[PDB]
Amino acid sequence: MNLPKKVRLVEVGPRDGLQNEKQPIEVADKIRLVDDLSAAGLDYIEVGSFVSPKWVPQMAGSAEVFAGIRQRPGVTYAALAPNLKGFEAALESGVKEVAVFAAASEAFSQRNINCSIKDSLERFVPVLEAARQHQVRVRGYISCVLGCPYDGDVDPRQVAWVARELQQMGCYEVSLGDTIGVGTAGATRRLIEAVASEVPRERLAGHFHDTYGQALANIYASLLEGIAVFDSSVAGLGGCPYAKGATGNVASEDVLYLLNGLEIHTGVDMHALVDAGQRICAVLGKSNGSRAAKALLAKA
Amino acid sequence: MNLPKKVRLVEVGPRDGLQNEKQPIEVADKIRLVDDLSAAGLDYIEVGSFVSPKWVPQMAGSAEVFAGIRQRPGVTYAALAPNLKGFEAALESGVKEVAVFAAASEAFSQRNINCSIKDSLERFVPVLEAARQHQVRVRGYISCVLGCPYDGDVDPRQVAWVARELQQMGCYEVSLGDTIGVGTAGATRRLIEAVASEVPRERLAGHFHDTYGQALANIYASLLEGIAVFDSSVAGLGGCPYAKGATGNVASEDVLYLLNGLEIHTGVDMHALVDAGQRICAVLGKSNGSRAAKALLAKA
Ligand code: NA
Ligand code: NA
């Protein structure tokens, strides 16, 4: 304390949330989601993905979403670009920021995407090069930062290594992803300390799944270490494949509740945020995955 | 850090959890619950209540539960005793520890129990006197420690005052109850600091509702302040009247997950704890209210 005075909420609801929901939704409702999120005062929203809709029907129509949304000038509207043709499709949509991904666990790399950590990093060089040419900034995600669903323990120096590779490839920010939600507050702080030996805290974000109920305590522990960017999903959209669809991403309203309570500035309006989450859950619907949102809705 | 090396989990599932579930259950299943909890290695279980079953059918048969459970010698099996006749009934059942209650908010006191804070404290003097005569120890709960559902902000000095009254009346331990779940990590630490001016940390416990998703972060913040006793409900039994039955007590497995992750000793076995929670939720059932338990169950 020693806490940040200002924090960035990275809203991944429309991409990572919707992607991990079983029910695909209409382009008109995705547009409304993003527009509701922009109305909530968020300055970073992951709008969609240029993964092949063949594999992820939930992400179909991302281009139409980009064309339909009312884009506010101070807000970044990012998209996942998993390969070159995905990047090119994103370019065609006027996307100014994309995200790529890597894993801290070799075993997880082999299982999730059928190659090693290095193979996948090298696969992304072409897209870093093209993004660099078109001045599209690239965010780098790491999975398994606090443990692997196959291998168990993940050494934080291993995470530090991949974080370093990603920043040295041209990623402007590295998102540390506890992507099975197994991490606890102390290991989280040690992880930040190990990674900060290679990449400064100001290029670091925390991406904490709430599958084991640990996400907010992890965020608080992260705040204590000076991390000021956190990825969350509005109304807790949707789940985890390793825990039969139980809770995935931490819910944005839960995080905002913490941050408001700490009197930390985010620029995000709770009522509007909750309103956005409510509308999309009804479309789904899906009972709201945010405890804070439900409680606030019940209260009103 | 500066963390405790050892923490007490106060299991309130059978009383506070079951009480706040809509479905009353059979005495045979309550006995099995408590027995499963004793098998999990818990050394403190709130077994039942001697509130009038007229008002709380969920608590009917508490005496039969006490008579039926296999009581392990090193374990405290506590009961709620809301008045003198409740205490006497508890005495008749061989109860060695009871809990009384108070509120940090006058407005909440008037609404919840139709008298002031002082009126209710005085009402409890007779039961403190009788418990003192029979060497039954008394635990004191405080509600609204981090905010009141009617009044809003609760000054931590006000909580400190009631904590002091309770210890000076003969309560051996005071449980600080964020009983609407509105508290956040920073206000939690300031609360502990204010209360510790009047009553030492070693007579303090944290009773954090998870209604707003804040409970574990609050517990972590509490650990950082040296609090080493936390009240939780196995499999997150059951809810909150101020949030239309949404999450009440923090779930025990969630807390244990944190504590195991911090390598803090509790003596509690996760597999057995989860097993107890699973069995009771099926009886209810009720999908498990513990994220950690669900994730662990899915994994197995
Ligand atoms: Na994720
Ligand atoms: Na309670």
- List C-alpha distances in Å: B143 to A90, B175, B181, B255: 53, 9, 11, 20
- Helix ranges, A99-240 (H): 106-113, 117-133, 156-168, 185-195, 215-224
Domain count, chain A: 1
DSSP code, position A249 = B
Q: Which residues contact B125 (CB under 8 A, 6 or more apart)?
A: B169
Q: Within 13 Å and on the Cβ side, how many CA atoms surround A241?
A: 7
Residue A157: phi and psi, rounded to 5, are -70, -35
Ligand 2 centroid–CA B256 distance in Å is 18
The closest alpha carbon to B259, from A173, A229, A214, belongs to A214
Relative to the alpha carbon of B207, which ligand is closest? 2
DSSP code, position A148 = B
Q: Which residues of B235-249 are buried (b: 16+ CB within 10 A; e: fewer)?
A: bbbbbbebbeebbbb
Q: Does B299 touch chain A (CB under 8 A)?
A: yes
Burial degree of A2 (CB within 10 A; 0-12, 13-18, 19+): exposed
**CA A137, CA A126: separation in Å to the nearest integer?**
14
Ligand 2 centroid–CA A251 distance in Å is 24
**CA B209, CA B77: separation in Å to the nearest integer?**
22
**Residue A266: domain span:** 1-300
Q: Which two tokens mark B70?
A: 């296999």
- Can you give the length of chain B in residues? 300
The closest alpha carbon to B235, from B251, B219, B247, B246, belongs to B251
Q: Is A163 helix (H, G, I), strand (E, B) or coil?
A: helix
**CA A215, CA A206: separation in Å to the nearest integer?**
10
**CA A184, CA B257: separation in Å to the nearest integer?**
8
Q: Which two tokens mark A79?
A: 């998209």
Mutate to test the interface with B, among A258, A259, A264, A273 (most CBs of B within 10 A): A258
A144, A171, A240, A281: the active-site residue: A240
Residues 68-107 of A with CB under 8 A from B: none
The closest alpha carbon to A229, from A170, A274, A272, A173, belongs to A173
Ligand 1 centroid–CA A12 distance in Å is 8
Dihedral of CA B238/B242/B244/B247: which sign?
negative
Residue A20: phi and psi, rounded to 5, are -100, 15
Relative to the alpha carbon of A250, which ligand is closest? 1
Relative to the alpha carbon of A231, which ligand is closest? 1
Q: To 5 degrees, how large is the angle CA A46–CA A22–CA B277?
A: 105
Which residues of chain A does B1 touch, with a Cβ-Cβ cutoff of 8 Å?
186
Which residues of chain A does B262 touch, with a Cβ-Cβ cutoff of 8 Å?
184-186
Distance of CA A19 to the CA centre of its chain: 12
**CA B231, CA B12: separation in Å to the nearest integer?**
7
Strand partners, B79: B48, B98
Q: Which two tokens mark A152?
A: 């168990």
Q: Cβ of A84: how many Cβ atoms within 10 Å?
A: 14
Q: Does A58 touch chain B (CB under 8 A)?
A: no
Q: Does A264 touch chain B (CB under 8 A)?
A: no
Nearest to B221 among A181, A220, A290 (CB): A220
Ligand 2 centroid–CA B103 distance in Å is 12
B144, B171, B240, B281: the active-site residue: B240
Mutate to test the interface with A, among B212, B288, B297 (most CBs of A within 10 A): B212
Q: Does B120 touch chain A (CB under 8 A)?
A: no
Cα end-to-end span (Å), chain B: 33
**CA A168, CA A241: separation in Å to the nearest integer?**
31
Dihedral of CA B231/B236/B238/B244: which sign?
positive
Q: Does B150 touch chain A (CB under 8 A)?
A: no
Nearest to A217 among B1, B217, B247 (CB): B217
CB contact under 8 A, A291 and B219: no
Q: How was this structure determined?
A: X-ray
Q: Which residues contact A234 (CB under 8 A, 6 or more apart)?
A: A11, A13, A17, A33, A37, A251, A252, A253, A273, A276, A277, A280, A290
Ligand 2 centroid–CA B253 distance in Å is 16
**Angle in degrees, 0-180, between the axes of helices A117-133 and A106-113, rounded to the nearest 10:** 70
- List C-alpha distances in Å: A274 to A33, A34, A252, A269, A300: 11, 13, 9, 9, 12
Min CA distance, A79 vs chain B (Å)? 28
Residue A34: phi and psi, rounded to 5, are -60, -40
Q: Which two tokens mark A17?
A: 């949330």
**CA A229, CA A222: separation in Å to the nearest integer?**
9
Q: What torsion do the CA atoms of A208, A214, A218, A219 make, to the nearest 10 degrees? A: 70
Q: Cβ of B37: how many Cβ atoms within 10 Å?
A: 28
Residue ranges of E strands in A12-67: 44-49
- List C-alpha distances in Å: A90 to A121, A123, A285, B100: 20, 17, 29, 62
Q: Cβ of A253: how many Cβ atoms within 10 Å?
A: 31
**CA B147, CA A299: separation in Å to the nearest integer?**
14
Mutate to test the interface with B, among A2, A216, A294 (most CBs of B within 10 A): A216
Query: Which residue of B lies nearest to A183 if distances are taken between CA atoms?
Result: B261
Q: Is A27 helix (H, G, I), strand (E, B) or coil?
A: helix
The closest alpha carbon to B177, from B200, B202, B210, B152, belongs to B210
CB contact under 8 A, B220 and A219: no
CB contact under 8 A, A292 and B186: no
The closest alpha carbon to A250, from A5, A3, A1, A10, belongs to A10
Contact of A235 with A253, CB cutoff 8 Å: yes
Q: Which residues of A133-170 are buried (b: 16+ CB within 10 A; e: fewer)?
A: eeebbbbbbbbbbbbbbeeeebebebbbbbbebbbebb
Q: Does B219 touch chain A (CB under 8 A)?
A: yes
Resolution in angstrom units: 2.4
Contact of B69 with B15, CB cutoff 8 Å: no
DSSP code, position A179 = S
Contact of A15 with A48, CB cutoff 8 Å: yes
Contact of B110 with B144, CB cutoff 8 Å: no
Across the A:B interface, residue pairs with CB atoms under 8 Å apart total 113
**CA B196, CA B192: separation in Å to the nearest integer?**
6
Residue ranges of E strands in A36-147: 44-49, 76-80, 97-103, 137-143
Nearest to B216 among A214, A263, A299 (CB): A214
Q: Cβ of B78: how many Cβ atoms within 10 Å?
A: 27
Nearest to B299 among A243, A261, A290 (CB): A243
Q: Is A225 helix (H, G, I), strand (E, B) or coil?
A: coil
Using the structure block, give the residue that is written with the tokens 């998703």: B213
Q: Is B281 a known active-site residue?
A: no
Cα end-to-end span (Å), chain A: 33
**CA A72, CA A177: separation in Å to the nearest integer?**
28
**CA A77, CA A94: separation in Å to the nearest integer?**
10
Q: Give me the CATH number covering residue A22.
A: 3.20.20.70
Q: Which residues contact A181 (CB under 8 A, 6 or more apart)?
A: A208, A209, A210, A211, A212, A214, A215, A240, A243, A247, A248, B295
Q: Is A288 helix (H, G, I), strand (E, B) or coil?
A: coil
- List C-alpha distances in Å: A244 to A239, B8, B145, B297, B298: 8, 32, 37, 10, 6
Burial degree of A291 (CB within 10 A; 0-12, 13-18, 19+): buried
Residue A80: phi and psi, rounded to 5, are -75, 135
Q: Is A46 helix (H, G, I), strand (E, B) or coil?
A: strand
Burial degree of A55 (CB within 10 A; 0-12, 13-18, 19+): exposed
Reduced 3-state DSSP string for chain B? CCCCCECEEEECHHHHHHHCCCCCCCHHHHHHHHHHHHHCCCCEEEEEECCCCCCCHHHCCHHHHHHHCCCCCCCEEEEECCCHHHHHHHHHCCCCEEEEEEECCHHHHHHHHCCCHHHHHHHHHHHHHHHHHCCCEEEEEEECCCCECCCECCCHHHHHHHHHHHHHCCCCEEEEEECCCCCCHHHHHHHHHHHCCCCCHHHEEEEEECCCCCHHHHHHHHHHCCCCEEEEEHHHCCECHHHCCCECECEHHHHHHHHHHCCCECCCCHHHHHHHHHHHHHHHCCCCCCHHHHHHHHHC
Dihedral of CA B208/B284/A239/A269: which sign?
negative
Which residues of chain A does B184 touch, with a Cβ-Cβ cutoff of 8 Å?
257-258, 260-262
**CA B193, CA B157: separation in Å to the nearest integer?**
10
Q: Which residues of B57-70 are buried (b: 16+ CB within 10 A; e: fewer)?
A: ebbbbbbebbebbe
